[PDB]
Amino acid sequence: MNIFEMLRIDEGLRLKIYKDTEGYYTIGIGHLLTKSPSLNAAKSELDKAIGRNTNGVITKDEAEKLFNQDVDAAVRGILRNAKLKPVYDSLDAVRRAAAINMVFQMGETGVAGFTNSLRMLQQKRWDEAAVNLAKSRWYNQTPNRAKRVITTFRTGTWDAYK
Ligand SMILES: [Cl-]
Ligand SMILES: [Cl-]
């Protein structure tokens, strides 16, 4: 198991524009296109992202390409963030994948606001962090996925994904 397979399981793969859990225009493996209500604004962003006139549909390769870029950007966002980096550096390889997952889903700002959980992870207080992480809108909105990520932080294994 690795970050890619992990996210592929949490996000699915869709080759036609769709709405995400929050109602936003998305395509591929969790690639947010726009928060605007316009399918056209979404269509425009899509073409801009792929480099061609797609009519709202992409191929699997295109999807994977977006995915590769998004994982990369996620990692780099963590590494550039003064609040995230230190926590991330302190973690083991499995837990790091859980961190990437959160950022991929909620953005670096989003994560950055979990100050208390962050401190707990950094101190390696696993059960405590797990409990604190659950007290969040994130958990309440996407509980099954949240549970998976949280278990990963708690145990340090890929058991939730097996
Ligand atoms: Cl893009
Ligand atoms: Cl869920």
PDB file of C-alpha atoms and ligand atoms in Angstrom:
ATOM      1  CA  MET A   1       0.000   0.000   0.000  1.00  0.00           C
ATOM      2  CA  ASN A   2       1.192   3.520  -0.707  1.00  0.00           C
ATOM      3  CA  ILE A   3      -0.243   7.082  -0.918  1.00  0.00           C
ATOM      4  CA  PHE A   4      -1.514   6.564  -4.477  1.00  0.00           C
ATOM      5  CA  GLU A   5      -3.378   3.418  -3.837  1.00  0.00           C
ATOM      6  CA  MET A   6      -4.671   4.909  -0.625  1.00  0.00           C
ATOM      7  CA  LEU A   7      -6.113   7.987  -2.258  1.00  0.00           C
ATOM      8  CA  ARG A   8      -7.412   5.942  -5.195  1.00  0.00           C
ATOM      9  CA  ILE A   9      -9.526   4.076  -2.671  1.00  0.00           C
ATOM     10  CA  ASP A  10     -10.739   7.148  -0.868  1.00  0.00           C
ATOM     11  CA  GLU A  11     -11.556   9.268  -3.917  1.00  0.00           C
ATOM     12  CA  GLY A  12     -12.551   6.763  -6.622  1.00  0.00           C
ATOM     13  CA  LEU A  13     -12.000   7.482 -10.334  1.00  0.00           C
ATOM     14  CA  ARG A  14     -14.579   9.283 -12.481  1.00  0.00           C
ATOM     15  CA  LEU A  15     -14.066  10.130 -16.034  1.00  0.00           C
ATOM     16  CA  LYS A  16     -16.923  12.621 -16.442  1.00  0.00           C
ATOM     17  CA  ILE A  17     -17.371  15.898 -14.430  1.00  0.00           C
ATOM     18  CA  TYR A  18     -19.187  15.136 -11.176  1.00  0.00           C
ATOM     19  CA  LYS A  19     -20.078  16.779  -7.979  1.00  0.00           C
ATOM     20  CA  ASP A  20     -18.100  16.014  -4.923  1.00  0.00           C
ATOM     21  CA  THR A  21     -19.429  15.465  -1.423  1.00  0.00           C
ATOM     22  CA  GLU A  22     -19.562  19.171  -0.910  1.00  0.00           C
ATOM     23  CA  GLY A  23     -21.297  19.664  -4.229  1.00  0.00           C
ATOM     24  CA  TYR A  24     -18.277  20.899  -6.225  1.00  0.00           C
ATOM     25  CA  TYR A  25     -17.419  20.150  -9.760  1.00  0.00           C
ATOM     26  CA  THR A  26     -14.671  17.496  -9.725  1.00  0.00           C
ATOM     27  CA  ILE A  27     -13.226  14.988 -12.293  1.00  0.00           C
ATOM     28  CA  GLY A  28     -10.790  12.024 -12.166  1.00  0.00           C
ATOM     29  CA  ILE A  29      -9.361  11.061  -8.792  1.00  0.00           C
ATOM     30  CA  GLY A  30     -10.639  13.796  -6.590  1.00  0.00           C
ATOM     31  CA  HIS A  31      -9.423  16.677  -8.734  1.00  0.00           C
ATOM     32  CA  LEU A  32     -11.448  19.726  -7.642  1.00  0.00           C
ATOM     33  CA  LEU A  33     -12.132  21.833 -10.661  1.00  0.00           C
ATOM     34  CA  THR A  34     -13.991  24.854  -9.180  1.00  0.00           C
ATOM     35  CA  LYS A  35     -16.238  25.894  -6.308  1.00  0.00           C
ATOM     36  CA  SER A  36     -18.456  27.873  -8.690  1.00  0.00           C
ATOM     37  CA  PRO A  37     -21.952  26.552  -9.404  1.00  0.00           C
ATOM     38  CA  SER A  38     -21.385  26.794 -13.120  1.00  0.00           C
ATOM     39  CA  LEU A  39     -20.890  23.746 -15.136  1.00  0.00           C
ATOM     40  CA  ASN A  40     -19.352  25.951 -17.700  1.00  0.00           C
ATOM     41  CA  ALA A  41     -16.831  27.472 -15.387  1.00  0.00           C
ATOM     42  CA  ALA A  42     -16.034  23.824 -14.525  1.00  0.00           C
ATOM     43  CA  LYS A  43     -15.823  22.917 -18.138  1.00  0.00           C
ATOM     44  CA  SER A  44     -13.457  25.820 -18.769  1.00  0.00           C
ATOM     45  CA  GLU A  45     -11.106  24.893 -15.926  1.00  0.00           C
ATOM     46  CA  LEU A  46     -11.102  21.333 -17.123  1.00  0.00           C
ATOM     47  CA  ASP A  47      -9.891  22.275 -20.610  1.00  0.00           C
ATOM     48  CA  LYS A  48      -7.343  24.568 -19.149  1.00  0.00           C
ATOM     49  CA  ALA A  49      -6.060  21.757 -16.913  1.00  0.00           C
ATOM     50  CA  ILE A  50      -5.862  19.109 -19.755  1.00  0.00           C
ATOM     51  CA  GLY A  51      -4.766  21.344 -22.540  1.00  0.00           C
ATOM     52  CA  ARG A  52      -7.545  20.436 -24.898  1.00  0.00           C
ATOM     53  CA  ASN A  53     -11.225  20.777 -25.606  1.00  0.00           C
ATOM     54  CA  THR A  54     -12.645  17.965 -23.529  1.00  0.00           C
ATOM     55  CA  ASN A  55     -16.363  18.485 -23.496  1.00  0.00           C
ATOM     56  CA  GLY A  56     -16.360  17.405 -19.797  1.00  0.00           C
ATOM     57  CA  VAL A  57     -14.779  14.043 -20.334  1.00  0.00           C
ATOM     58  CA  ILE A  58     -11.157  12.802 -19.994  1.00  0.00           C
ATOM     59  CA  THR A  59      -9.360   9.529 -20.404  1.00  0.00           C
ATOM     60  CA  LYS A  60      -7.904   7.377 -17.631  1.00  0.00           C
ATOM     61  CA  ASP A  61      -4.349   8.498 -18.486  1.00  0.00           C
ATOM     62  CA  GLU A  62      -5.420  12.150 -18.217  1.00  0.00           C
ATOM     63  CA  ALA A  63      -6.993  11.315 -14.915  1.00  0.00           C
ATOM     64  CA  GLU A  64      -3.802   9.729 -13.678  1.00  0.00           C
ATOM     65  CA  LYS A  65      -1.813  12.592 -14.840  1.00  0.00           C
ATOM     66  CA  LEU A  66      -3.927  15.048 -12.852  1.00  0.00           C
ATOM     67  CA  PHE A  67      -3.640  12.691  -9.914  1.00  0.00           C
ATOM     68  CA  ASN A  68       0.180  12.578 -10.094  1.00  0.00           C
ATOM     69  CA  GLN A  69       0.310  16.321 -10.169  1.00  0.00           C
ATOM     70  CA  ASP A  70      -2.066  16.680  -7.227  1.00  0.00           C
ATOM     71  CA  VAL A  71      -0.180  14.296  -4.966  1.00  0.00           C
ATOM     72  CA  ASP A  72       3.043  16.082  -5.776  1.00  0.00           C
ATOM     73  CA  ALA A  73       1.539  19.478  -5.079  1.00  0.00           C
ATOM     74  CA  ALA A  74       0.157  18.175  -1.819  1.00  0.00           C
ATOM     75  CA  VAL A  75       3.499  17.016  -0.571  1.00  0.00           C
ATOM     76  CA  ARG A  76       5.157  20.242  -1.620  1.00  0.00           C
ATOM     77  CA  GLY A  77       2.440  22.241   0.098  1.00  0.00           C
ATOM     78  CA  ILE A  78       3.163  20.415   3.294  1.00  0.00           C
ATOM     79  CA  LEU A  79       6.859  20.937   2.905  1.00  0.00           C
ATOM     80  CA  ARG A  80       6.463  24.672   2.342  1.00  0.00           C
ATOM     81  CA  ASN A  81       4.151  25.165   5.274  1.00  0.00           C
ATOM     82  CA  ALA A  82       5.808  26.344   8.482  1.00  0.00           C
ATOM     83  CA  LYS A  83       3.149  24.778  10.621  1.00  0.00           C
ATOM     84  CA  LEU A  84       2.933  21.501   8.743  1.00  0.00           C
ATOM     85  CA  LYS A  85       6.478  20.651   7.886  1.00  0.00           C
ATOM     86  CA  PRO A  86       7.730  20.037  11.358  1.00  0.00           C
ATOM     87  CA  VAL A  87       4.865  17.706  12.139  1.00  0.00           C
ATOM     88  CA  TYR A  88       5.257  15.868   8.883  1.00  0.00           C
ATOM     89  CA  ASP A  89       9.031  15.458   9.433  1.00  0.00           C
ATOM     90  CA  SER A  90       8.435  13.953  12.751  1.00  0.00           C
ATOM     91  CA  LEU A  91       6.223  11.190  11.369  1.00  0.00           C
ATOM     92  CA  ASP A  92       6.913   7.683  10.118  1.00  0.00           C
ATOM     93  CA  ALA A  93       6.226   6.663   6.506  1.00  0.00           C
ATOM     94  CA  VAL A  94       2.689   5.298   6.978  1.00  0.00           C
ATOM     95  CA  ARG A  95       1.519   8.242   9.049  1.00  0.00           C
ATOM     96  CA  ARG A  96       3.012  10.565   6.492  1.00  0.00           C
ATOM     97  CA  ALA A  97       0.646   9.080   3.936  1.00  0.00           C
ATOM     98  CA  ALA A  98      -2.249   9.889   6.276  1.00  0.00           C
ATOM     99  CA  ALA A  99      -1.038  13.466   6.436  1.00  0.00           C
ATOM    100  CA  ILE A 100      -0.873  13.719   2.663  1.00  0.00           C
ATOM    101  CA  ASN A 101      -4.390  12.376   2.435  1.00  0.00           C
ATOM    102  CA  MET A 102      -5.804  15.065   4.680  1.00  0.00           C
ATOM    103  CA  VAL A 103      -4.073  17.815   2.728  1.00  0.00           C
ATOM    104  CA  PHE A 104      -5.163  16.367  -0.609  1.00  0.00           C
ATOM    105  CA  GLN A 105      -8.762  16.441   0.649  1.00  0.00           C
ATOM    106  CA  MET A 106      -8.935  19.612   2.586  1.00  0.00           C
ATOM    107  CA  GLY A 107      -6.174  21.821   1.580  1.00  0.00           C
ATOM    108  CA  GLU A 108      -3.330  23.059   3.411  1.00  0.00           C
ATOM    109  CA  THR A 109      -5.198  25.821   5.075  1.00  0.00           C
ATOM    110  CA  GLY A 110      -7.862  23.426   6.180  1.00  0.00           C
ATOM    111  CA  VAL A 111      -5.364  21.123   7.847  1.00  0.00           C
ATOM    112  CA  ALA A 112      -3.304  23.939   9.194  1.00  0.00           C
ATOM    113  CA  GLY A 113      -6.305  24.849  11.450  1.00  0.00           C
ATOM    114  CA  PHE A 114      -6.129  21.498  13.304  1.00  0.00           C
ATOM    115  CA  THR A 115      -3.538  23.009  15.576  1.00  0.00           C
ATOM    116  CA  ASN A 116      -4.286  20.935  18.610  1.00  0.00           C
ATOM    117  CA  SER A 117      -4.306  17.595  16.763  1.00  0.00           C
ATOM    118  CA  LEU A 118      -1.088  18.654  15.015  1.00  0.00           C
ATOM    119  CA  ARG A 119       0.664  19.183  18.331  1.00  0.00           C
ATOM    120  CA  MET A 120      -0.569  15.848  19.493  1.00  0.00           C
ATOM    121  CA  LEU A 121       0.698  14.072  16.466  1.00  0.00           C
ATOM    122  CA  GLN A 122       4.035  15.736  16.833  1.00  0.00           C
ATOM    123  CA  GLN A 123       4.270  14.513  20.362  1.00  0.00           C
ATOM    124  CA  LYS A 124       3.260  11.004  19.279  1.00  0.00           C
ATOM    125  CA  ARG A 125       0.238  10.855  21.526  1.00  0.00           C
ATOM    126  CA  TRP A 126      -1.693   8.633  19.147  1.00  0.00           C
ATOM    127  CA  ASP A 127      -4.868   7.776  20.882  1.00  0.00           C
ATOM    128  CA  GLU A 128      -5.264  11.359  21.975  1.00  0.00           C
ATOM    129  CA  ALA A 129      -4.787  12.766  18.565  1.00  0.00           C
ATOM    130  CA  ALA A 130      -7.272  10.284  17.182  1.00  0.00           C
ATOM    131  CA  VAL A 131      -9.877  11.462  19.614  1.00  0.00           C
ATOM    132  CA  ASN A 132      -9.175  15.130  18.884  1.00  0.00           C
ATOM    133  CA  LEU A 133      -9.204  14.622  15.146  1.00  0.00           C
ATOM    134  CA  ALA A 134     -12.761  13.218  15.356  1.00  0.00           C
ATOM    135  CA  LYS A 135     -14.108  16.484  16.793  1.00  0.00           C
ATOM    136  CA  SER A 136     -14.336  18.113  13.508  1.00  0.00           C
ATOM    137  CA  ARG A 137     -16.640  19.003  10.701  1.00  0.00           C
ATOM    138  CA  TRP A 138     -14.377  16.770   8.521  1.00  0.00           C
ATOM    139  CA  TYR A 139     -15.247  13.744  10.587  1.00  0.00           C
ATOM    140  CA  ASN A 140     -18.888  14.594  10.768  1.00  0.00           C
ATOM    141  CA  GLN A 141     -19.231  15.087   6.967  1.00  0.00           C
ATOM    142  CA  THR A 142     -17.116  12.223   5.715  1.00  0.00           C
ATOM    143  CA  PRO A 143     -17.042   9.865   8.623  1.00  0.00           C
ATOM    144  CA  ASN A 144     -15.991   6.609   6.875  1.00  0.00           C
ATOM    145  CA  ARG A 145     -13.079   8.199   5.119  1.00  0.00           C
ATOM    146  CA  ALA A 146     -12.144  10.207   8.214  1.00  0.00           C
ATOM    147  CA  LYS A 147     -12.210   6.994  10.270  1.00  0.00           C
ATOM    148  CA  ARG A 148      -9.817   5.389   7.818  1.00  0.00           C
ATOM    149  CA  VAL A 149      -7.299   8.228   7.956  1.00  0.00           C
ATOM    150  CA  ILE A 150      -7.618   8.533  11.738  1.00  0.00           C
ATOM    151  CA  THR A 151      -7.008   4.815  12.231  1.00  0.00           C
ATOM    152  CA  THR A 152      -3.923   5.185  10.169  1.00  0.00           C
ATOM    153  CA  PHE A 153      -2.659   7.953  12.432  1.00  0.00           C
ATOM    154  CA  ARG A 154      -3.609   5.936  15.486  1.00  0.00           C
ATOM    155  CA  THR A 155      -1.982   2.649  14.523  1.00  0.00           C
ATOM    156  CA  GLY A 156       0.648   3.467  12.096  1.00  0.00           C
ATOM    157  CA  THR A 157      -0.448   0.527   9.830  1.00  0.00           C
ATOM    158  CA  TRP A 158      -2.541   0.236   6.724  1.00  0.00           C
ATOM    159  CA  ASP A 159      -5.090  -1.857   8.384  1.00  0.00           C
ATOM    160  CA  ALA A 160      -8.037   0.435   7.624  1.00  0.00           C
ATOM    161  CA  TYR A 161      -7.306   0.044   4.023  1.00  0.00           C
ATOM    162  CA  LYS A 162      -7.040  -3.669   4.028  1.00  0.00           C
TER     163      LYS A 162
HETATM  164 CL    CL B   1      -4.361  21.945 -12.673  1.00  0.00          CL
HETATM  165 CL    CL B   2     -17.172   8.912   4.155  1.00  0.00          CL
END
